[PDB]
Write a protein that binds this ligand. Structure first.
Ligand SMILES: CCCCNC(=O)[C@H](C)C[C@H](O)[C@@H](N)C[C@H](CNC(=O)c1ccccc1OCCCOC)C(C)C
Ligand SMILES: CCCCNC(=O)[C@H](C)C[C@H](O)[C@@H](N)C[C@H](CNC(=O)c1ccccc1OCCCOC)C(C)C
Lengths: 331, 333
């Protein structure tokens, strides 16, 4: 019976990473926990000094984990934000309390933009075996294997910028949501994607009636749409593009409509407050939105994806055993 | 025997963790610190001259309202690492969460404003052993233990990342809703004090410091992790932080990059990443955020020691096991 709770760090509301320890003795890295992919990886005490990205991070030393059993496979993880390439090996990862012996990637090649913007070191994928590049069996399907935690559900709390945020493997941590869940169902097992039958703005449904797809990605900073969805949405908030990104001007952020994401029956609404990055109400300044365009490519893509922005407002729970997702007001 | 009481605590800015005791019949309630570095109990006294303006700003024990107060009057002076208080003895019934003890305590009559003008708590409930209690005033935990009440002769401290309950002490056990993983116990070097042998602090990668060994008192009534000036400043050299008089300070936009500090308590490696020890009020180029580790030299009564205060208890649930004279740490949640 377990609830293993991993406490997270909220770095500027653009990224929340918590920590695993790998090896015996454990070597701890800060990692993001990603429901949009399935492979666990950390940098290697091997990663080329010329990837400022290796240099900078923390690096796994395969020769200090007594328990380490190498394997070899050149792994190539193409992520929607950049592609890392390393080689596969085995050790003991400690998650919270739990201890799983898990094959992971040792990243060797690591392309600086963006993993040097990564304030973290690696990713644990809470995704599916079906997404796992090279059928390496993911940590949750594997922790599940040993049968220790008490429900195979795991949930995410992301806090506003303090606690920071937590993952609870085994159930929900009830102090951080209010009311009871209402679940939405996976379209097909293999992805934590669900169906939005619309995105409204204030009142009027603007797009995505005759619904479009929703990836629920905990390893994502924002709400994302296709360039042109996001276009029409910005176009309606009044928000305008500055150079990179869209802004609105701070004193007017109170004015903006709500977006409402109609997920299966219910409506998950977000106010200006939840999506405008409000460093003041100054009349004299521009304030960024936390909704962003990002083209996800088509295995998985092209899809809208609900990352941190959504999850700060709604506690999410990933009900692995019923292949569905729950949401409740987070607090 | 069998009982567990739990005291609840209020967390003021991860710096002050105070709970509340009731002394007297009727009870005068006082906000106090449950301190494992000292072993006397004291509260400000009605007789404190209000020229000490800490006594103007605190709540005082007016002993002519307790029907139970038993005079005793021996003066004692309490010399803490941060400042000294002086006063005399008294006896009355203190309540420490449900449990009731008659207890000899100090009525403090001279309370120097620095640093107690700065303290949200009114007094101290020393949780140490009798070998460090000034004047042998048999410590509150030995009194509850002679009462035959508790399920186990242990107390546990849970200090919470501030922001709903601030923390919780359990008397007689350990609450497994605030720890995960298994306990890890480190034995005491001597009986008399909650101090354990520690070998090597690691900044980032290599055992930078306390290589061969040094002591670590695990003091719940202290906000920071302390180390000897002669040793912290080298740790501080490495982290590259600045001295600003009483604390250390780093340019705020560095914080979230500063290398993990690791502690080697008795056979495992307890580790703080840079959230754990950095008071991130900003991510600016300007603004200096404060590191929550700073130097301070505990005097050689209790050796010169590293003191592991609320920055470590905040991550590892601590069970002070008096019964086997050892301290166990586990993960907090
Ligand atoms: C198996 C190959 C992946 C297939 N699936 C995908 O690519 C999904 C569309 C999305 C994918 O999971 C995506 N979440 C990956 C993320 C993206 N991370 C970054 O690119 C990243 C780098 C620097 C700074 C921030 C970044 O995002 C962190 C967001 C997490 O904080 C909540 C991983 C690497 C932590
Ligand atoms: C029995 C006499 C032995 C004295 N020995 C010692 O001085 C010990 C080594 C340290 C001692 O435990 C020390 N921690 C005492 C504490 C320290 N507190 C303060 O100095 C202090 C003053 C103002 C504001 C806060 C302070 O710290 C409280 C921190 C507790 O919150 C976790 C007392 C005065 C409440």
């Amino acid at each position: 019976n377990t609830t293993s709770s991993v406490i997270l760090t909220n770095y500027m509301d653009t990224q929340y990473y918590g920590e695993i320890g790998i090896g015996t003795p454990p070597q701890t890295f800060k990692v993001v926990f990603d429901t949009g992919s399935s492979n666990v990886w950390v940098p290697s005490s091997k990663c080329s000094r010329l990837y400022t990205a290796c240099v900078y991070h923390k690096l796994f030393d395969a020769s200090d984990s007594s328990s380490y059993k190498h394997n070899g496979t050149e792994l190539t993880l193409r992520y929607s934000t950049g592609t890392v390439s390393g080689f596969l090996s085995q050790d003991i990862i400690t998650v919270g309390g739990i201890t799983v012996t898990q094959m992971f990637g040792e990243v060797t090649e690591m392309p600086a933009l963006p993993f040097m913007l990564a304030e973290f070191d690696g990713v644990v994928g809470m995704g599916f075996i079906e997404q796992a590049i090279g059928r390496v069996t993911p940590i949750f399907d594997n922790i599940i294997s040993q049968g220790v935690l008490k429900e195979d559900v795991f949930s995410f709390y992301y806090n506003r910028d303090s606690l920071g945020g937590q993952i609870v493997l085994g159930g929900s941590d009830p102090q951080h949501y209010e009311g009871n869940f209402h679940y939405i169902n996976l379209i097909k097992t293999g992805v934590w994607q669900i169906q939005m039958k619309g995105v409204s703005v204030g009142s009027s449904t603007l797009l995505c009636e005759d619904g479009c797809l929703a990836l629920v990605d905990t390893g994502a900073s924002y709400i994302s749409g296709s360039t042109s969805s996001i276009e029409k949405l910005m176009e309606a908030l009044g928000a305008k593009k500055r150079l990179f990104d869209y802004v609105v001007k701070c004193n007017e952020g109170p004015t903006l409509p709500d977006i409402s994401f109609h997920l299966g029956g219910k409506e998950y609404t977000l106010t200006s407050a939840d999506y405008v990055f409000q460093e003041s109400y100054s009349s004299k300044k521009l304030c960024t939105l936390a909704i962003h365009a990002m083209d996800i490519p088509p295995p998985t893509g092209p899809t809208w994806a609900l990352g941190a922005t959504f999850i700060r407002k709604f506690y999410t729970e990933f009900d692995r055993r019923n292949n569905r997702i729950g949401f409740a007001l987070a607090r």
